[PDB]
Design a protein around this motif. Structure first.
Motif, PDB file in Angstrom:
ATOM      1  N   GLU A 138      -3.688   8.005   2.845  1.00  0.00           N
ATOM      2  CA  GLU A 138      -4.991   7.633   3.355  1.00  0.00           C
ATOM      3  C   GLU A 138      -4.883   7.150   4.798  1.00  0.00           C
ATOM      4  N   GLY A 195      -9.195  11.236  -1.947  1.00  0.00           N
ATOM      5  CA  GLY A 195      -8.523  10.526  -3.021  1.00  0.00           C
ATOM      6  C   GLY A 195      -7.157  11.091  -3.364  1.00  0.00           C
ATOM      7  N   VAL A 225     -17.148   9.375  -0.380  1.00  0.00           N
ATOM      8  CA  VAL A 225     -18.216   9.750   0.524  1.00  0.00           C
ATOM      9  C   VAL A 225     -17.710   9.744   1.942  1.00  0.00           C
ATOM     10  N   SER A 226     -17.863  10.860   2.629  1.00  0.00           N
ATOM     11  CA  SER A 226     -17.392  10.971   4.001  1.00  0.00           C
ATOM     12  C   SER A 226     -18.519  11.103   5.006  1.00  0.00           C
ATOM     13  N   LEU A 282     -14.667  14.688  10.236  1.00  0.00           N
ATOM     14  CA  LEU A 282     -15.056  13.592   9.393  1.00  0.00           C
ATOM     15  C   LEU A 282     -14.536  12.270   9.864  1.00  0.00           C
ATOM     16  N   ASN A 283     -15.338  11.251   9.645  1.00  0.00           N
ATOM     17  CA  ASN A 283     -14.987   9.861   9.878  1.00  0.00           C
ATOM     18  C   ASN A 283     -14.482   9.603  11.290  1.00  0.00           C
ATOM     19  N   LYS A 310       0.823  -1.178   0.000  1.00  0.00           N
ATOM     20  CA  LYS A 310       0.000   0.000   0.000  1.00  0.00           C
ATOM     21  C   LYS A 310       0.865   1.239   0.000  1.00  0.00           C
ATOM     22  N   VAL A 366      -7.496  11.824  10.442  1.00  0.00           N
ATOM     23  CA  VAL A 366      -8.126  12.515   9.340  1.00  0.00           C
ATOM     24  C   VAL A 366      -7.942  14.009   9.484  1.00  0.00           C
TER      25      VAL A 366
HETATM   26  C1  LIG Z   1     -14.022   8.238   5.303  1.00  0.00           C
HETATM   27  O1  LIG Z   1     -13.960   6.809   5.069  1.00  0.00           O
HETATM   28  C2  LIG Z   1     -14.272   6.484   3.705  1.00  0.00           C
HETATM   29  C3  LIG Z   1     -14.314   4.986   3.662  1.00  0.00           C
HETATM   30  O2  LIG Z   1     -14.975   4.387   4.763  1.00  0.00           O
HETATM   31  C4  LIG Z   1     -13.226   7.099   2.771  1.00  0.00           C
HETATM   32  O3  LIG Z   1     -13.508   6.857   1.377  1.00  0.00           O
HETATM   33  C5  LIG Z   1     -12.567   5.910   0.756  1.00  0.00           C
HETATM   34  O4  LIG Z   1     -11.412   6.604   0.214  1.00  0.00           O
HETATM   35  C6  LIG Z   1     -10.471   5.713  -0.404  1.00  0.00           C
HETATM   36  C7  LIG Z   1      -9.381   6.634  -0.867  1.00  0.00           C
HETATM   37  O5  LIG Z   1      -9.848   7.848  -1.439  1.00  0.00           O
HETATM   38  C8  LIG Z   1     -11.117   4.977  -1.575  1.00  0.00           C
HETATM   39  O6  LIG Z   1     -10.233   3.962  -2.081  1.00  0.00           O
HETATM   40  C9  LIG Z   1      -9.820   4.141  -3.479  1.00  0.00           C
HETATM   41  O7  LIG Z   1     -10.658   3.326  -4.345  1.00  0.00           O
HETATM   42  C10 LIG Z   1     -10.272   3.374  -5.728  1.00  0.00           C
HETATM   43  C11 LIG Z   1     -11.257   2.390  -6.465  1.00  0.00           C
HETATM   44  O8  LIG Z   1     -11.275   1.029  -5.892  1.00  0.00           O
HETATM   45  C12 LIG Z   1     -12.358   0.181  -6.403  1.00  0.00           C
HETATM   46  O9  LIG Z   1     -11.949  -1.211  -6.576  1.00  0.00           O
HETATM   47  C13 LIG Z   1     -11.532  -1.824  -5.335  1.00  0.00           C
HETATM   48  C14 LIG Z   1     -11.112  -3.306  -5.652  1.00  0.00           C
HETATM   49  O10 LIG Z   1     -11.098  -4.198  -4.479  1.00  0.00           O
HETATM   50  C15 LIG Z   1     -12.729  -1.806  -4.341  1.00  0.00           C
HETATM   51  O11 LIG Z   1     -12.350  -2.389  -3.138  1.00  0.00           O
HETATM   52  C16 LIG Z   1     -13.150  -0.370  -4.091  1.00  0.00           C
HETATM   53  O12 LIG Z   1     -14.295  -0.321  -3.206  1.00  0.00           O
HETATM   54  C17 LIG Z   1     -13.525   0.209  -5.408  1.00  0.00           C
HETATM   55  O13 LIG Z   1     -14.518  -0.523  -5.933  1.00  0.00           O
HETATM   56  C18 LIG Z   1      -8.802   2.859  -5.833  1.00  0.00           C
HETATM   57  O14 LIG Z   1      -8.363   2.899  -7.151  1.00  0.00           O
HETATM   58  C19 LIG Z   1      -7.886   3.733  -4.998  1.00  0.00           C
HETATM   59  O15 LIG Z   1      -6.515   3.239  -5.065  1.00  0.00           O
HETATM   60  C20 LIG Z   1      -5.477   4.292  -5.012  1.00  0.00           C
HETATM   61  O16 LIG Z   1      -4.559   4.153  -3.885  1.00  0.00           O
HETATM   62  C21 LIG Z   1      -3.792   2.932  -3.920  1.00  0.00           C
HETATM   63  C22 LIG Z   1      -2.882   2.905  -2.626  1.00  0.00           C
HETATM   64  O17 LIG Z   1      -1.600   2.187  -2.773  1.00  0.00           O
HETATM   65  C23 LIG Z   1      -2.942   2.933  -5.224  1.00  0.00           C
HETATM   66  O18 LIG Z   1      -2.169   1.783  -5.285  1.00  0.00           O
HETATM   67  C24 LIG Z   1      -3.871   2.991  -6.426  1.00  0.00           C
HETATM   68  O19 LIG Z   1      -3.120   3.023  -7.664  1.00  0.00           O
HETATM   69  C25 LIG Z   1      -4.655   4.245  -6.300  1.00  0.00           C
HETATM   70  O20 LIG Z   1      -3.803   5.281  -6.274  1.00  0.00           O
HETATM   71  C26 LIG Z   1      -8.381   3.643  -3.601  1.00  0.00           C
HETATM   72  O21 LIG Z   1      -8.374   2.355  -3.229  1.00  0.00           O
HETATM   73  C27 LIG Z   1     -12.323   4.233  -1.014  1.00  0.00           C
HETATM   74  O22 LIG Z   1     -13.015   3.513  -2.058  1.00  0.00           O
HETATM   75  C28 LIG Z   1     -13.255   5.197  -0.402  1.00  0.00           C
HETATM   76  N1  LIG Z   1     -14.408   4.480   0.080  1.00  0.00           N
HETATM   77  C29 LIG Z   1     -15.592   4.652  -0.452  1.00  0.00           C
HETATM   78  C30 LIG Z   1     -16.725   3.896   0.159  1.00  0.00           C
HETATM   79  O23 LIG Z   1     -15.753   5.398  -1.420  1.00  0.00           O
HETATM   80  C31 LIG Z   1     -13.299   8.603   2.996  1.00  0.00           C
HETATM   81  O24 LIG Z   1     -12.350   9.295   2.157  1.00  0.00           O
HETATM   82  C32 LIG Z   1     -12.997   8.904   4.403  1.00  0.00           C
HETATM   83  N2  LIG Z   1     -13.070  10.323   4.587  1.00  0.00           N
HETATM   84  C33 LIG Z   1     -12.009  11.060   4.680  1.00  0.00           C
HETATM   85  C34 LIG Z   1     -12.239  12.515   4.864  1.00  0.00           C
HETATM   86  O25 LIG Z   1     -10.879  10.578   4.622  1.00  0.00           O
END
Ligand SMILES: *[C@@H]1O[C@H](CO)[C@@H](O[C@@H]2O[C@H](CO)[C@@H](O[C@@H]3O[C@H](CO[C@H]4O[C@H](CO)[C@@H](O)[C@H](O)[C@@H]4O)[C@@H](O)[C@H](O[C@H]4O[C@H](CO)[C@@H](O)[C@H](O)[C@@H]4O)[C@@H]3O)[C@H](O)[C@H]2NC(C)=O)[C@H](O)[C@H]1NC(C)=O
Ligand SMILES: *[C@@H]1O[C@H](CO)[C@@H](O[C@@H]2O[C@H](CO)[C@@H](O[C@@H]3O[C@H](CO[C@H]4O[C@H](CO)[C@@H](O)[C@H](O)[C@@H]4O)[C@@H](O)[C@H](O[C@H]4O[C@H](CO)[C@@H](O)[C@H](O)[C@@H]4O)[C@@H]3O)[C@H](O)[C@H]2NC(C)=O)[C@H](O)[C@H]1NC(C)=O
Ligand SMILES: *[C@@H]1O[C@H](CO)[C@@H](O[C@@H]2O[C@H](CO)[C@@H](O[C@@H]3O[C@H](CO[C@H]4O[C@H](CO)[C@@H](O)[C@H](O)[C@@H]4O)[C@@H](O)[C@H](O[C@H]4O[C@H](CO)[C@@H](O)[C@H](O)[C@@H]4O)[C@@H]3O)[C@H](O)[C@H]2NC(C)=O)[C@H](O)[C@H]1NC(C)=O
Ligand SMILES: *[C@@H]1O[C@H](CO)[C@@H](O[C@@H]2O[C@H](CO)[C@@H](O)[C@H](O)[C@H]2NC(C)=O)[C@H](O)[C@H]1NC(C)=O
Ligand SMILES: *[C@@H]1O[C@H](CO)[C@@H](O[C@@H]2O[C@H](CO)[C@@H](O)[C@H](O)[C@H]2NC(C)=O)[C@H](O)[C@H]1NC(C)=O
Ligand SMILES: *[C@@H]1O[C@H](CO)[C@@H](O[C@@H]2O[C@H](CO)[C@@H](O)[C@H](O)[C@H]2NC(C)=O)[C@H](O)[C@H]1NC(C)=O
Ligand SMILES: *[C@@H]1O[C@H](CO)[C@@H](O)[C@H](O)[C@H]1NC(C)=O
Ligand SMILES: *[C@@H]1O[C@H](CO)[C@@H](O)[C@H](O)[C@H]1NC(C)=O
Ligand SMILES: *[C@@H]1O[C@H](CO)[C@@H](O)[C@H](O)[C@H]1NC(C)=O
Ligand SMILES: *[C@@H]1O[C@H](CO)[C@@H](O)[C@H](O)[C@H]1NC(C)=O
Ligand SMILES: *[C@@H]1O[C@H](CO)[C@@H](O)[C@H](O)[C@H]1NC(C)=O
Lengths: 122, 448, 122, 122, 448, 448
Positions: free
Chosen positions: E166, E333, E388-389, E216-217, E33, E209
């Motif tokens: 993150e 993100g 979504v936060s 948040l969160n 990660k 956070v």
């Molecule tokens: C409050 O808490 C919520 C969650 O409870 C946070 O929202 C999450 O934020 C993270 C980061 O922004 C999101 O994760 C990103 O998802 C992208 C898409 O993934 C899809 O496919 C995977 C496959 O298993 C599924 O599990 C996932 O649900 C999706 O369907 C990824 O592409 C992103 O990856 C990035 O980081 C990695 C780290 O090494 C890199 O390697 C990648 O190349 C890329 O850069 C990442 O994983 C997550 O999905 C969010 N959750 C939701 C529900 O949306 C809130 O952000 C948090 N609030 C605050 C303020 O932090």
């Protein structure tokens, strides 16, 4: 016989040199750039190990002795070997392996027995 | 009728991992030799390193899981990087170069004559610098256009010319509370029990020689050639062969260089190759033929003990890859040689020296330990370099893919530096002393 | 008299303040950038010295005492000075110099005597 | 009751678990970039605190005991509370507050009494 | 008739300040990660974190004087700065820029299309780079002349694109000799006695956070919305409001970016915005209206318990200042959003979602923790970002200056990150164990 | 009839070397004065530093082998270098300069008016900077061509203008397990026994004043002028003369400067001399004549006690070498003065103030502690500088080569900063406490 010279000796004979090993636990007394931090960590760790063992001897009532008897009876489930083999044929290395699953049991019993004795002494 | 008696100072131990002290044995003066192996490792050795034989003690060893290998590896890399930390950076060299071929009595387009606009101590002034480069350090961009090979990947720094990297024996010593167990079994193959074990506070001195394919200046086996491996039948594992004799190798860089230097910044001295006095000759290494032939014949005789005496063993050269892997890489006088060892492995065994010469290439831009990152620039050395090294062992690998034809093929593979330390450290194990323990006695504490 | 207040006192009188110095050995309890590593090294070293001396008292059977008698006889080769001069005229500073080549001899004798006593107690 | 499980217990009952807390003082035995220096400092400090308290028990003649009686009489000026309330109704937390201005007094008295005893034992 | 008896191992303690250990709970792999919160904090958690209830123990807490807040603050800043230490510097970007407006279907002069002469891996070559910038990062110098906003003040570095920031839950653990006391009183308001106290060696995990105005969160309050402050009547202090429910916020950066990269030095990779696929849309956040309305109505009901139930409570937007203070700043993100929260605070209380949308601005040059010094450059993220936060709380301040009209005004003020850690750490206190003590007994030492 | 009795807590000690703590005594606020001697050395002093007289204790001291001197030396250099570590580098100043002579009412070609193309915060822009330099910092390259003197040797950095180097008294304190012995003998000459010894945990405060040839602002001798040396008859050794009175020296830099500043990079502020208001005057120092004359007459009277009262003592100026050695170098108000002390040593002794003025030179590029390496640039100070210092001592050397004419020559030589710390530290020695020991008693252990 020198440090660990008695390692292959039987338990009885080996006890004749207990001071030899005791004196080599704090030998570190004679012995920023990360080279310095690594050496300092090693020194601190040696001290911590020394104290952890010394504390247990304290807790069990043997703080001032190399050899001490307690009031906890020996269990045949730990070892049912003849007492004479234990002291005359067996070595400490073998012995530690032989009863290795009981060290924590014996230590718990020693802690309880000593605490009871002190309660009664008061 | 028996009770627990507690004993403290009991001579027993357990396998453990810890940090060892580095001792120099005073073979060099830190302030006169400026040897990186003398500085930092400034702890003196014991002038009377009394060893204690352990009578009737049997212990097991495993050279492949020996934490001392990792400890040596980490410490060498760190020392190296710390040693280069205060040296002059050569990033101002990432400029275009105008280059031609050397105008001399050369038989093999090995050398490039390049010119460029280099910095000076003042920001308003540039200077023309002319120097020769080995072709391996210089690549094309598109009187032709060239750049240094490292410029698209990483920063390059100059090794300080005043600093020696010549290895000296280093002794490792246990911290208080720990002890080192040494196995003396003449036939020890790296794993399993050893019945001849002594305890020392320090290992003997090991020279941290970097040599890839052939093990140089190490210790010798006694009585027989010993072949050790993690797994005899795994073709993905290396075979470390320790000779009980030695082979002398004479390596030379015959071109007589004139070394020049300029300031490229405020006290920032840069060294370059200048020019060559006399004619041009190829770098090379000489090994007596009979000696080499016997050396491998002995290795084969021993390999057959694992594969069958009815087998056929052939040797072949490197399978492919980068020069750092396929050639024999070593430091001779500060220079970095990449020798073509195929001349050593062109032979099959079945049921007046006439020395073999291995041509060698020279590189000035060195990537140590297969890392991608900063490169070290090896400054040229004034004059002519010659040294003689002792082959004390080999690293061999098998191709595998065998159909049980019995015609097995061995190559000078490997290249992972940890193996060249493992080859010496295999004799030692470190354990933790556990002085506290119990036993039954016919003794009860006075009742209170 | 305060710390080392008795330094010029004779040995007998000086013994009256042994607790004064003992309590100043761990006073360090009240007392990255290399300034930090140097201070940390000093603290570790003070601990190591404390323990090395405490271990010897342990080994000799005097772990809990400021003053303890043993079973090792005094050699006239160490000192043939009148006992009364030793305690009433001489100071500890002078004394340490007077018998400085025997400290390691005396300590070895103490180690052996205590080990023999424990062997016999069992 | 576990570590500090007895914290709300009365003093008498609380004494039944003294080994529980004693064993958690050197628990650090299980537990360059400044992250490393901070952790190392914490380890050294824990050792220093352990030793400072152990030294006092040594000085007072209680080095080997969890509970020990001395020859220093109790002052009513420290506490004139009924002995039975002290052991059966009061907790150690309350007690420490109750006599908090006397800890240094009591310790000084203990140091003197033990030194006098050793003087007389010789 | 009583004598001093000395007891060792006595279960008592005193208020203390010390250093806590950082444990990860294995939610991320350091090597897969590349999460800054996983590295460094590599200590594992207790898989069975047995908690000990302290029967009949009353203790006092003070969240406003709680040293754990300072400890978290210092450690987060340090981690952040260490994490960026090996990354590529972008000081070669402090060049003049030629910029125009974006030639796309844009409704709001938010984006600048700039070109410049950037460095390359060779000192003799420059390259033309074209990229889009958000207007907040670019300022004028006097087809118009622009420079990056940080260039007259400090160095700018690029966050490594491979490193994730993150947050993961982090547990803090006491060093040996110390213990953590946890208050379970459901109505605990941050100060004074708590009668439901347990001892743990570690805190629960808290996600670090960063969110300025809205919390948040985080964790939720049980039973009621809890309003905590250092001083209810001090308008210079912040009010931390912890909700017993959550509000979901959907934040999006709808523009589909093509991310491009170039070398600007020897392995010095630089990332830039490239261009936008499709039309241009404004970044924004969505909150359901009914949910928000109930959320504040609950807050008002509770605020009235401190100001009077006959009072009038109005909410208003930020009073003024820098975007880092006046807008809601958060990391979604990897992107940095600055949202206009005035849409949330335009309401007064007296005696089919229809979501409210908050427009947001985006910045790439980030000054963390209100420090003047080095700025972090946030590389753009390929594609479209949505997250979504959970709003778990608010920071409110009062204007003060009241004439007792009862019409008090609350705003989304504060902005000091220590408060966003205090809001979780309020449940824990750390104390030193003091095992040695005395008591009278009817026991005298045997006389000798 | 006697047995060994072991005693612990015995008040004895041995010579030892260790590390001392640095305490500030709260004379400056770290955050208000920004004094390098206040930061780092943040340990408070003992408000009641009770000293313990050791009755009937005789001990030997040796100031020439006193490890505290080395400790002070190492720590000062380190502090200095750490203090300058975060400051702006001035390597962009290594450009050519166009220079002329100052167009003012100047009598002595001391000042050069130079112009150059300096960097700006953007890489595309250069700016013309005009400044005045003292000739000692500027050298020729071949409306004339000049460069800064350090540019062919080392990097130059700017001292942070916000940081004060003004010395404050510093107290050194022993680590636990060690003690400091102070000699109070009024006639102590640096070596041999002292019968008036007390023990302290801390030394008194010593101001770390850097002053080469004359010892400034130190302590005074009581009763008599004391002359101390390692070896009276060794002309290769320095003689440290401690006065029992003081001489006031008034040093001034009369030119009223206007200090200007520019950005030469991203927050990289550079300060320069601007110009001079009013006429030009030479820097100088004033000493009352009668006072100086008596001061040396007293020194001579005491020197004769070692050489004979029938001898002739003459004083002469520096023999030669660099200004850092031959002139009196000191820091006055942040400025660096190099004063011509020959005016103080033009006299021979045999069997209305009329102050002597010493002309002084000013340098901005300073090489501290005779190191070859980085130079510090001293920014100019706005306005006019005046200070008054106390000469508390002298460093004298003899020429030697004597034919026993009795006409011995003394000069203001030395220049090794360790001697200016030795001159105060001579009163203290540090020893290790050795609490464990034995003695015979008429007592045997109870037999068991
Ligand atoms: C409050 O808490 C919520 C969650 O409870 C946070 O929202 C999450 O934020 C993270 C980061 O922004 C999101 O994760 C990103 O998802 C992208 C898409 O993934 C899809 O496919 C995977 C496959 O298993 C599924 O599990 C996932 O649900 C999706 O369907 C990824 O592409 C992103 O990856 C990035 O980081 C990695 C780290 O090494 C890199 O390697 C990648 O190349 C890329 O850069 C990442 O994983 C997550 O999905 C969010 N959750 C939701 C529900 O949306 C809130 O952000 C948090 N609030 C605050 C303020 O932090
Ligand atoms: C296996 O082990 C062998 C030796 O057992 C190694 O070979 C040695 O390698 C070193 C370094 O390459 C050689 O030492 C060099 O010798 C040069 C000539 O010295 C002559 O004069 C001295 C005078 O007393 C004689 O002792 C010596 O025998 C020669 O007659 C020196 O000029 C070199 O000095 C360089 O380094 C120093 C370090 O501070 C600098 O100050 C100098 O300016 C200069 O840079 C150096 O001393 C040594 O001679 C070789 N031995 C032999 C027998 O040839 C193998 O290299 C080693 N194998 C591997 C793989 O490492
Ligand atoms: C031997 O010891 C003497 C003193 O005993 C030293 O001389 C002193 O040197 C210091 C520094 O050079 C002088 O202090 C400077 O004074 C300037 C004027 O201050 C006036 O107003 C204040 C108001 O309270 C009065 O107290 C003071 O007496 C004056 O009337 C200040 O402007 C200077 O400030 C500078 O440093 C601070 C540090 O943070 C900055 O913030 C400021 O902006 C500015 O840069 C400074 O305070 C002191 O006055 C001198 N004393 C005398 C009597 O003249 C000798 O130097 C010393 N010898 C040696 C060799 O060190
Ligand atoms: C490498 O190129 C340089 C540059 O042309 C050669 O040096 C020149 O040699 C001629 C021979 O008479 C001289 O007249 C020039 O003045 C030299 N140039 C300089 C800059 O000195 C050099 O000989 C070439 N080297 C090789 C080995 O080909
Ligand atoms: C930003 O400016 C660049 C530079 O002019 C634009 O890219 C050009 O687009 C035209 C369109 O046909 C091409 O012909 C040019 O070759 C492009 N230039 C380059 C360097 O590729 C770019 O489209 C502008 N972007 C926006 C969003 O306005
Ligand atoms: C140092 O040189 C500068 C540059 O010539 C002098 O400044 C000039 O002074 C004349 C006098 O009228 C002005 O007209 C110019 O505009 C000034 N130039 C600048 C750049 O301002 C400066 O006076 C000289 N200083 C000394 C002391 O000789
Ligand atoms: C040197 O000669 C070889 C011969 O094939 C040629 O390929 C090469 O390009 C030449 N290089 C230069 C720099 O002239
Ligand atoms: C973009 O359009 C706005 C509209 O007012 C104008 O003010 C701005 O200067 C334009 N910017 C550029 C870079 O063309
Ligand atoms: C690069 O510099 C030149 C000046 O010679 C300027 O005309 C050009 O516009 C610059 N390029 C860019 C992309 O700004
Ligand atoms: C300044 O005047 C002196 C007088 O001799 C002359 O030597 C010097 O070169 C002049 N310097 C400049 C920079 O004009
Ligand atoms: C700046 O460089 C130019 C060369 O193009 C030179 O003529 C000019 O004098 C320099 N400026 C200064 C102040 O030296």
């Amino acid at each position: 016989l020198g440090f660990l010279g008695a390692a292959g000796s039987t338990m009885g004979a080996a006890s004749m040199t207990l001071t030899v090993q005791a004196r080599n636990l704090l030998s570190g007394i004679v012995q920023d750039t990360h080279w310095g931090i690594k050496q300092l960590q090693a020194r601190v760790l040696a001290v911590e190990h020394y104290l952890r063992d010394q504390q247990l001897l304290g807790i069990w009532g043997c703080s001032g002795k190399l050899i001490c008897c307690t009031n906890v009876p020996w269990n045949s489930s730990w070892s049912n070997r003849n007492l004479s083999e234990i002291w005359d044929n067996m070595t400490w290395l073998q012995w530690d392996k032989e009863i290795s699953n009981y060290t924590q049991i014996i230590y718990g019993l020693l802690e309880e027995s000593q605490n009871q004795q002190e309660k009664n002494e008061q | 009728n028996l009770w627990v008696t507690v004993y403290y100072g009991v001579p027993v131990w357990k396998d453990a991992e810890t940090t060892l002290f580095c001792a120099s044995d005073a073979k060099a003066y830190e302030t006169k030799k400026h040897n990186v192996w003398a500085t930092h490792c400034c702890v003196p050795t014991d002038p009377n390193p009394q060893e204690i034989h352990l009578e009737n003690v049997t212990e097991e060893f495993n050279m492949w899981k020996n934490n001392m290998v990792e400890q040596m590896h980490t410490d060498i890399i760190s020392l190296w990087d710390q040693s280069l930390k205060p040296c002059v950076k050569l990033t101002p060299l990432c400029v275009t170069l105008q280059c031609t071929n050397v105008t001399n009595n050369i038989t093999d387009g090995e050398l490039k004559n390049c010119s460029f606009n280099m910095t000076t101590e003042l920001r308003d002034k540039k200077q023309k610098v002319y120097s020769l480069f080995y072709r391996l350090d210089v690549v094309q961009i598109n009187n032709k256009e060239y750049r240094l090979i490292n410029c698209n990947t990483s920063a390059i720094t100059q090794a300080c010319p005043k600093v020696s990297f010549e290895p000296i024996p280093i002794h490792y010593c246990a911290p208080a509370g720990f002890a080192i167990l040494k196995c003396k079994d003449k036939k020890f193959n790296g794993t399993g029990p050893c019945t001849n074990v002594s305890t020392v506070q320090c290992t003997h001195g090991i020279k941290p020689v970097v040599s890839t394919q052939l093990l140089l200046n190490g210790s010798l086996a006694e009585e027989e050639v010993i072949i050790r491996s993690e797994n005899i039948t795994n073709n993905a594992k290396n075979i470390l062969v320790q000779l009980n004799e030695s082979v002398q190798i004479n390596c030379t860089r015959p071109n007589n260089n004139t070394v020049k230097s300029i300031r490229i910044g405020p006290g920032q001295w840069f060294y370059y190759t200048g020019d060559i006095i006399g004619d041009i000759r190829q770098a090379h290494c000489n090994v007596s033929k009979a000696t080499w032939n016997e050396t491998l014949g002995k290795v084969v005789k021993q390999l057959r003990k694992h594969f069958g005496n009815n087998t056929i063993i052939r040797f072949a050269n490197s399978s492919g890859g980068d020069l750092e892997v396929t050639t024999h890489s070593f430091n001779c006088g500060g220079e970095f040689f990449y020798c073509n060892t195929s001349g050593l492995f062109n032979s099959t065994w079945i049921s007046s020296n006439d020395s073999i010469t291995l041509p060698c290439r020279i590189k000035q831009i060195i990537n140590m330990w297969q890392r991608i990152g900063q490169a070290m620039y090896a400054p040229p050395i004034q004059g002519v370099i010659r040294c003689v090294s002792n082959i004390t062992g080999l690293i061999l690998t098998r191709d595998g893919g065998s159909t049980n034809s019995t015609t097995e093929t061995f190559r000078p593979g490997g290249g992972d530096m940890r193996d060249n330390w493992r080859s010496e450290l295999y004799k030692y194990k470190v354990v933790k002393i556990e002085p506290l323990g119990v036993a039954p006695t016919r003794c009860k504490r006075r009742v209170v």
